[PDB]
Subunit: 247 residues, 4 copies
Amino acid sequence: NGFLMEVCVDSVESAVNAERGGADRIELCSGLSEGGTTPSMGVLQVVKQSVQIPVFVMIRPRGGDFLYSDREIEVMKADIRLAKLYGADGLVFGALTEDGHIDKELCMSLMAICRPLPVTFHRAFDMVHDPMAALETLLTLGFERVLTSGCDSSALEGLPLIKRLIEQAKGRIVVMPGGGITDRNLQRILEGSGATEFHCSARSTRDSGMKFRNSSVAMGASCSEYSLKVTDVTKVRTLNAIAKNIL
Amino acid sequence: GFLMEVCVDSVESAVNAERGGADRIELCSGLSEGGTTPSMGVLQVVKQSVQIPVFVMIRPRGGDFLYSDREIEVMKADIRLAKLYGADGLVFGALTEDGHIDKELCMSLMAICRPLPVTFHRAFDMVHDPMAALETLLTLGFERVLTSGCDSSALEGLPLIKRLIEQAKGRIVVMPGGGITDRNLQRILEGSGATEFHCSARSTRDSGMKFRNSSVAMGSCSEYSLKVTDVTKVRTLNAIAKNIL
Amino acid sequence: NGFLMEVCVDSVESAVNAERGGADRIELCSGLSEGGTTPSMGVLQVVKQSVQIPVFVMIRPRGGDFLYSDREIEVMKADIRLAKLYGADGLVFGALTEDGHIDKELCMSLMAICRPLPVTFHRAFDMVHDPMAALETLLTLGFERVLTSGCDSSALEGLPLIKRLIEQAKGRIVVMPGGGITDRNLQRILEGSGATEFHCSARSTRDSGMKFRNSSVAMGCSEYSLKVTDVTKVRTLNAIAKNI
Amino acid sequence: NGFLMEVCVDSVESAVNAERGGADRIELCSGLSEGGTTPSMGVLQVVKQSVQIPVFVMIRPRGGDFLYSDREIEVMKADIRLAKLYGADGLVFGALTEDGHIDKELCMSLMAICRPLPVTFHRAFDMVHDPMAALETLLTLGFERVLTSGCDSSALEGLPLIKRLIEQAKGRIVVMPGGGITDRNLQRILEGSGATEFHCSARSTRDSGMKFRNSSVAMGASLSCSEYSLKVTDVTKVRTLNAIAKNIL
């Protein structure tokens, strides 16, 4: 112990696997192939009745930017209210202005509907113009946590900025590295930032059980309709053994 | 009269679809994966912004339609919540390993959907025996099937959809879907005899963001583009439908 | 009979497979991922030494538009000279203006260098603003063939315009349907367009033979699959053709 | 050599840009979206009349693995011969066995034909079972350069392994890091590996000059529309990478 591991998840099997392999917290995502959108209340319900670890709930009404229209803001608020109702232990979101600044006013009204639950500000943070200022606005606003790959393609690549962010934060806010953390990665990202909480994916692909396949059909939008991505217990295990070995 | 259906992702799209003349919207999350079950908040707001029937997708992930116990229990919970929150219909599909429709599960799920009409979705295009499949959906009581004739699109699958509509004899509404555009609608309608049809009618638009950072990928081809149900596109698809009479 | 089947090909294995399946002509089109780029001269040579059927060579310096700069044009001319030299029976290219008109002057300039080989104007044609006018321009310039999917997502999809182009051509230019044709739609394509030459890619995926695999690495999908022109696919397309 | 920079390039404009930005060497590529395919011989000719820096040439008959059949290698042999004939200043291929070993016999054949030109073993090396042992056999075969990501998804990710490889190579072979190097990760990579030569891309993406556009058409793959965009190696990106290199030591 000493470190906390978060795993984004999309199914009851993945949630259970993640808890099984030593995750301390799960983020419930839909649309993870798009960075995560707000899950259905039905997965929340079954996950909550399947796992004891906290279940944080993603509030993103679509992929793309985090410049939300009034109608998207309305959808976000309803989803906050319902996520509470059905047992979320936390909430995750992010909102920017067109200039790459966090949107204070919108963050204010979304936070007000989230309280008492902890709220982490997500990778929208990586799309910000001035991150050091962004971090400042986040804490005056009272976000417990920020998920960041240091405004770069991944946590390892963004390490130097993660490091600086942790220093600026001084424990007032949990700066969480996220984006591309693997077995091969974790130690360097931990030892190089001073972070105590981290977010990882730890999925592996598994072929479908279908015996009859029809290669002609593409349902999605433009690799196979017969593979599944599932949070892998063994991967989650080795991430935890790495975390406990650096202490 | 024809009736046109449109999958939709957001309130904006739902609204656009309605004003462009759509007769029914399906609420989908995860369009890029063929449709996943949407949050309950889109439902609620959409249900307040629109007077047209709103069908809800019940699909706990992309990929196959061979669901585990924990997945079917997620589907069951979502069906109840969707009724609770105002759905006017449900959409879903389930197959066995052999590529047959899974009667037992369809029955289970059907039982929880009642009284709402259900449409068996594109799972159907992944069947080994469509004529038999259609028969068992028929005996199970699904009102609708969405299908591209087991091919990569409605135009490509047109001969089989035509045969299906012949086999159905109006007992079930065979709805062509899959890449239906303003350019192929007339052919798809004239060549199938279909009365209802499913399209997407989206156009991709640019983000309002002035500050951009090309280095991060949330994941995809871009983080600064949006696809929205286009009113113009829905409108002309509707115009094409009122020229085929 | 009276149908010629053309197949894009990447490798000698695909070339052989094509011919062995009944193809009448092959196009050598590196970079199939991107609609075809101009192949290495070394694949021409080995293919030319492995196959009896005519081998047409693709002249495309890159993916994307067909708005070629001078340096790109310079590269296209050099590659046209080299393809001739290494035994191409035909050349394939296409060039457009900013307003989606075919580029007359550049087409004449590349044509003059291609002679006497037949030339086919390719899918660039699908990106034109007025295809009926473009067609008239292509025959005025002497392209023997045009590859086209009716300016739409695929040949089935663009079929009604392909039909109108063939009626306009009056057999003065071969209008070759191409986008996405397979065994499930061949018949329809031919019967609904009246085309006599058609273009396809009858490829199938194979698993790599690598026993040891490193999933973390990428290259510039899967790092462990192969697409290969399929003999049995090509044969069936030939059978569908012979029986119409 | 003293931070030597190599850029792999699609076209002449990009080759010219790379030279102008301070690139020391260029690898000529076709099919960059697939990790590098053997380029037409016509690019080489024109590139060779537009640039003074050495121009190395990819010999790779397709994407995917480096498990080449007989006809594939007979194409590689012909392209090596053809590339020498047209001015290649170097060669770079690389092959493997099913087991993840470098294929010694095949490498000897291809090597025999490339001589006297320098050859680099490319990122087939990252797909190898045991990279230390692989480094030895490349050393035994006489490759002057290896392009490598330390067997991971990028040079940064594989930095620790590239460090150990440079440590064991002892200057006998040039260990050149490559995956995803940029102007925001060059310094870490040089500083944490001790490498003297490095490979990057330095591209930016431009909108096509096409004014009339047809969105309904896709040329290649599967609906992976683009479609008027173009990737060109960027003079100023290469220049900044070079300034960073010169700044280190």
